[PDB]
Amino acid sequence: NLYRELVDRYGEYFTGAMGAESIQKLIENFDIDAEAESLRDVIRNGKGQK
DNA sequence: CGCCGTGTCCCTCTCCCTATAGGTTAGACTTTAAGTCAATAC
Numbered sequence: 001n002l003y004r005e006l007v008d009r010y011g012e013y014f015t016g017a018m019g020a021e022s023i024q025k026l027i028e029n030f031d032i033d034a035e036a037e038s039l040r041d042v043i044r045n046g047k048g049q050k
Numbered sequence: 051c052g053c054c055g056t057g058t059c060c061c062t063c064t065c066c067c068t069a070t071a072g073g074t075t076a077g078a079c080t081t082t083a084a085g086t087c088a089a090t091a092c
Contacts, residue, residue: 048054 007016017025042050 003016015025016022
């Protein structure tokens with residue numbers, strides 16, 4: 001209910017889907033390099049469970 | 051007020067019927083490759 005009432009009032013500004021095609025879109029829009037460097041930074045500085 | 055260890059638990063691995071339209075095959079007709087005989091010459 002919440003989802004349909006956001007999309008029919010705020011139809012622009014974003015794209016939202018459901019299912020495996022959405023996961024495929026996520027993998028499409030995913031920079032492996034910057035995320036990997038962020039993980040390197042986290043291991044370099046962070047500690048604990050993180 | 052803001053994050054970190056210990057504990058418990060969940061999970062995984064191992065030893066009905068009707069009506070229309072169209073495709074398929076089986077069955078027979080005429081043609082052809084095939085088996086056959088008779089006389090002959092060297």
